[PDB]
Amino acid sequence: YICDVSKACKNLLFRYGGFCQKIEADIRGAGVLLDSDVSGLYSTIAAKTSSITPTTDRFNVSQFFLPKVQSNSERFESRSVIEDLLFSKIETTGPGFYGDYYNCKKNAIQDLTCAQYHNGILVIPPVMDAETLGMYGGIAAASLTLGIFGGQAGITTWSLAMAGRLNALGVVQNALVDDVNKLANGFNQLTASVGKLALTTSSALQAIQAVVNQNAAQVESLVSGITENFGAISTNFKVISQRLDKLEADVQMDRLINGRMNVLQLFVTNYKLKIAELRNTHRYVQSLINECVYAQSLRNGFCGQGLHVLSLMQNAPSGIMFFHYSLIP
């Protein structure tokens, strides 16, 4: 990144007080912490289903949250309908390397690599990479039934599971078919309203766009750090030593090396700052899966305000979206 093919520049890098050793130790240890968190997340996500699959009667959960069935076309898709809408409502960041990276992840073409290499920098996927997976399919699939049918299977339908959930929330003693259908209509209208979320009104879509906008701004910084010359006559090191005398060649090479060191060091700091936030974000995320999605919680306001009926989860660009359903008076 600093001294692209110049052997003269690489013979000058030892002067700086362990810079290149410390960069490569920090970016590698941060990915170890990233892989340690993502692995713990996917062992929490992976969960047992019932050997007999219950039937969704009037609740349209399989049409929205479950992976799309392969049509009359050899274009396999792992995403659900909701997971596709979350990728497609996020705005572009324009031309460039990151916009090329996003559109490879959005298009999700089978057996096509999305890794890029530029100027000594490889972009490697993490250990699981949520951006190519559907939440409720695959090898590491999440359970759809575990938090309302429970861990001792046998409830045959979603109508019988929802009637027991309304009984335990104290709103109906013995739910009739009109009580459960009223809950199934309100579920299906809300789930169909997810497809009409705009970026200007949805604070969840706004939280995704803020992550996508910070990634593009960081990529431009790495692209600009090797485009500009920081005051030297060229970015070619052999040009500099050939045209100038010894004192001025050493002044201007010091300007390029320090200019590129500052940009590269700033990327590693921002990357370490994002890892340190995500350590305690993951512990919060594991608590939402264990206590809101795969169980029924007793904690007020933890799965949304009001009496908690159901929580589901979907993959999003660089993360996870939780769908909390509640009854407020």
Binding site: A46, P95, P125, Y294
Partner: protein, 562 residues
């Protein structure tokens, strides 16, 4: 050569500081480990070997228990530039026949190894080792002379030396002193012992595994997945991209009848013939001929390099005329960014022309030749419009505005223009690879940014870029070469993850499998509201799970002035 003692290489390697038990990479002009680069033939006489490069190394034969007695070897060698004149420096190194002999080393200017010279910088004689095998060398990379007769090292920077041509003789005994001309700079991984002496080396470019040894700073590489090994590609500089017309003539120095100011001419955006600035007779400009036989317009600069390497910026040139007393041209006061030069006009009357070039900001360039068309379809590190980029050029029907020579889409360079033709800049995807390494005889390669479907690598687009290792399997991780790819098999015990739910199984041969995770249950039991089937456990497994959380650090007090 038939036998070079490669265990003698340890004594010529050194680090900057003394390092106990470490493993480090050093870099410099070092002897080749290829035995065919060495020179030791036996014949009826002493054979004269030659070489071109940046250095030389030498080994004397094992003297003890060899039926030699006292005769050792002379190893007369000389180093010189491409055009030896009265004005160039050369080296001459001689040892005589016998033991307890002194090496003589001479760096002089000879008019004719000769006895009488104009002047010498090194005129020295010193004893040498003969009781064992001995290795020494002389290097002159970037005009920094280093004379390495261990344990001592003599060093001296001498600008404009330009040594390249090596000659060497050696008297056959019984064998002969062996010789190796060094052509390029090498990287070497070394291991030191307790006292700091190198006991194990390995050159970083002798093979594929050697490059990975230097990348990891390890001699014995355990099995694993090692990312971001890089391929180097040659370079191509464009100081300009268009054709330039010829430069004007040098201003005439003859002032007519009285005192007059000098005549200034602007040189900018043109191709120059510098030896047109002299009369053309060799005796007038001999002091301007470089040791490589090349004409150089300048003798002294302020802030610039006096040696002109094919392109400079634009300048304003003024001329004049003087008289030298006792054949000595005096350099005048030079402002910053100025260069001075001169040649004889009337040598018998001691009259000379001079010229001062004042390199002012113009934006344009003065070169000695026009650029060439690029070689398309290969990955080259280019430099165009002061910006360096690695990539591949293809001819294109795209058009952009004539004022520009490069075209960006956002921050990405998409098109350039060279000699009036427009080229699409494409990325060379095969510059980076990972190694899926079991041992030195069994590894697989992963080209993580290269989609190697059979349509792409068969096209005429990829014809000049195809290596044998690019014919692998296209995966979601990139191009996988000589590893088997099995995305239907699973592993719950993954020691070697690749990313994206893939794992590398490195037990028998190199296989890529899928990762899985063990499925867990929950403790929430849904309430029983009617008669139905339920699934109760029959027995339980007791499980211990560990969880580490960092809670503390030491405190620090800092005196930042200290």
């Amino acid at each position: 050569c038939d036998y070079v003692d490669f265990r003698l290489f340890n004594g010529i390697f050194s680090t900057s500081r003394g390092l106990s038990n470490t493993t480090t990479v050093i870099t410099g002009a070092y002897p080749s480990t290829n035995k065919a680069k060495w020179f030791c033939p036996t014949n009826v006489g002493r054979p004269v070997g030659t070489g071109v490069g940046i250095g030389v190394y030498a080994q004397t034969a094992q003297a003890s228990y060899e039926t030699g007695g006292s005769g050792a070897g002379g190893y007369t060698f000389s180093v010189s530039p491409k055009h030896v004149t009265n004005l160039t420096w050369s080296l001459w190194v001689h040892r005589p026949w016998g033991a307890n002999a002194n090496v003589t080393v001479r760096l002089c200017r000879w008019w004719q190894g000769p006895s009488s010279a104009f002047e010498c910088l090194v005129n020295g004689s010193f004893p040498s080792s003969q009781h064992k095998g001995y290795m020494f060398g002389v290097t002159w990379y970037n005009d920094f002379v280093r004379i390495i007769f261990p344990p001592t090292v003599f060093e001296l920077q001498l600008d404009g030396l330009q040594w390249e041509y090596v000659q060497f003789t050696g008297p056959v005994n019984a064998r002969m002193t062996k010789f190796n001309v060094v052509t390029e700079i090498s990287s070497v991984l070394v291991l030191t012992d307790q006292s700091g002496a190198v006991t194990r080396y390995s050159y970083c470019a002798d093979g594929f595994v050697n490059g990975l040894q230097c990348k990891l700073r390890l001699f014995d590489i355990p099995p694993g997945v090692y990312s971001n090994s890089e391929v180097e590609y040659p370079v191509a500089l464009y100081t300009v991209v268009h054709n330039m017309s010829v430069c004007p003539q040098r201003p005439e120095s003859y002032c007519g009848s009285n005192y007059c100011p000098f005549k200034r001419v602007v040189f900018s955006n043109c191709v120059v013939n510098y030896t047109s600035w002299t009369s053309g007779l060799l005796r007038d400009y001999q002091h301007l001929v470089l040791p490589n036989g090349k004409f150089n317009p300048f003798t002294e600069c302020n802030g610039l390099n006096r040696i002109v390497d094919d392109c400079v910026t634009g300048f304003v040139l003024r001329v004049g005329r003087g008289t030298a007393v006792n054949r000595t041209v005096i350099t005048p006061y030079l402002k910053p960014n100025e260069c001075f030069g001169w040649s004889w006009n009337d040598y018998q009357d001691s009259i000379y022309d001079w010229w001062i070039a004042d390199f002012v900001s113009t934006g344009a360039f003065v070169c000695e030749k026009n650029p060439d068309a690029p070689r398309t379809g290969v990955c080259i590190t280019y430099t165009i419009e002061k910006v360096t980029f690695q990539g591949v050029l293809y001819e294109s029907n795209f058009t952009f505005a004539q004022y520009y020579n490069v075209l960006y889409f956002g921050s990405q360079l998409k098109y350039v223009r060279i000699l009036g033709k427009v080229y699409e800049v494409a990325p060379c995807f095969e510059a980076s690879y990972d190694v899926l390494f079991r041992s030195s005889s069994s590894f697989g390669l992963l080209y993580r940014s290269f989609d190697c479907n059979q349509l792409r690598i068969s096209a005429s687009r990829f014809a000049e870029r195809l290596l044998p290792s690019h014919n692998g399997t296209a995966t979601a991780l990139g191009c996988l070469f000589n590893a088997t790819y099995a995305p239907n098999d699973t592993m719950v015990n993954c020691t070697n993850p690749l990313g994206d739910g893939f794992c590398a199984d490195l037990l028998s041969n190199v296989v890529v499998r899928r990762m899985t995770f063990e499925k867990h249950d929950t403790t929430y039991v849904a309430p029983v509201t009617n008669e139905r089937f339920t699934e109760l456990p029959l027995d339980h497994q007791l499980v211990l799970t560990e969880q580490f959380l960092q809670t503390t650090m030491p405190k620090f007090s800092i005196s930042c002035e200290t």
